[PDB]
Symmetry: none
Subunit: 121 residues, 2 copies
């Protein structure tokens, strides 16, 4: 769910997930995809497509178990969809962290982004 | 759309919507509902709940017509959903103004990963 996702983002990235990634480029946020503006944005694009693949579980609401042991996210067995969902969230948080180097606040918006079409997932 | 909502928030509250309420508490702005931290946050919880009852339209991208007449938000007729979208945004703008007395900056860019599971709407 958004709870686990936001926690993973904070854990990996050290950033407030909402402030940094809640409205960033074409894909980070709630608006849905666009051609990524940079590496961070690409992370969010992949994450959304990752969400497209799940079977019926609700990525926003469905809670799942994961471990932060030795400061690595380990998705609990849960069940198939939930496990996959967890792996999607883990992958974005890792990705966002890996790309903090080029994170660019100019890509933050109040203001619904200005994006070319995304490729289909 | 976020455009009308931001404009209403600014008209009611006199604050920059994005900075003051874009990330406030557990309920305001991008990324989920949680147990409201306070009155302001509760306005946003109610707003998100209101959004859930919306049928034909998207609050984030769908434009709608309202007017500010004698310093009051007046939702156009619109169609059913957009009248209802408009009224959700009007109600949260009013609520946020009504609760400016307890607005708490410390919640302004609250770390949402600290929020705990909210009641269903």
């Amino acid at each position: 769910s958004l709870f686990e996702l936001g926690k993973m983002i904070l854990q990996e990235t050290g950033k407030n997930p909402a402030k940094s990634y809640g409205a960033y480029g074409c894909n980070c946020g709630v608006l849905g995809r666009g051609k990524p503006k940079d590496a961070t944005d690409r992370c969010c694009y992949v994450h959304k497509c990752c969400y497209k693949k799940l079977t019926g579980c609700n990525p926003k609401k469905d809670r799942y178990s994961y471990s932060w042991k030795d400061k690595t996210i380990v998705c609990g067995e849960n069940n198939p969809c939930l496990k996959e969902l967890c792996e999607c969230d883990k992958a974005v948080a890792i990705c966002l962290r890996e790309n903090l180097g080029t994170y660019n606040k100019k890509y933050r918006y109040h203001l619904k982004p200005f994006c070319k079409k995304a490729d289909p997932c």
